[PDB]
Amino acid sequence: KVFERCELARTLKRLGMDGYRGISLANWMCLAKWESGYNTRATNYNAGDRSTDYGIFQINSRYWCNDGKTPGAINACHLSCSALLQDNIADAVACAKRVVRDPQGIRAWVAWRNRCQNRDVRQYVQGCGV
Numbered sequence: 001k002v003f004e005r006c007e008l009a010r011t012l013k014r015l016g017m018d019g020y021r022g023i024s025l026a027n028w029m030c031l032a033k034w035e036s037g038y039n040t041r042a043t044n045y046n047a048g049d050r051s052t053d054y055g056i057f058q059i060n061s062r063y064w065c066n067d068g069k070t071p072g073a074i075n076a077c078h079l080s081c082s083a084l085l086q087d088n089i090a091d092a093v094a095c096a097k098r099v100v101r102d103p104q105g106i107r108a109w110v111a112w113r114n115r116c117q118n119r120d121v122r123q124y125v126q127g128c129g130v
Contacts, residue, residue, distance in 0.1 A: 001041070003037050003065075005029070005033075005128065006130075008032060009029055010129060012089075012093070015089070017093060018130065020097055020102065022105070023099075023106045024042035025125055025130055026121035026124050026125045027106055028106075029124035030121045031112045032110065033124060034111045034114075040055055040092070043085070044058060050069070050070060055092045057084075057101065059077070059095055059096065061073055062105060064076045064077045064099060065083065067082055076099075079094075079095055
């Protein structure tokens with residue numbers, strides 16, 4: 001599924017993401033925007049280390065979800081990577097929360113540092129009723 005901006009904002013807000021561990025909803029939108037264009041079916045393979053990024057947040061298979069084909073991979077969100085490709089993002093959100101419970105927080109995603117960190121993210125949540 002390809003979420004529309006405000007459609008995703010309220011969906012994230014309803015799932016308990018506004019300010020989760022200090023991360024505003026604007027930040028989460030900027031991340032989803034840049035990681036996948038709000039696309040839940042998005043997947044990017046990494047031929048370099050044989051891992052795959054899954055979903056609207058592009059969560060990597062080496063650490064967060066099990067796909068059975070990533071060498072010495074771990075499954076921190078204790079989820080099949082398949083769960084990250086559903087139209088329903090509740091599982092992806094639980095996993096993204098798990099990711100940010102780590103030291104780096106939202107910094108875990110390099111794309112956030114590149115396009116969201118220290119930038120004007122209001123635009124992502126404007127007009128959305130959040």
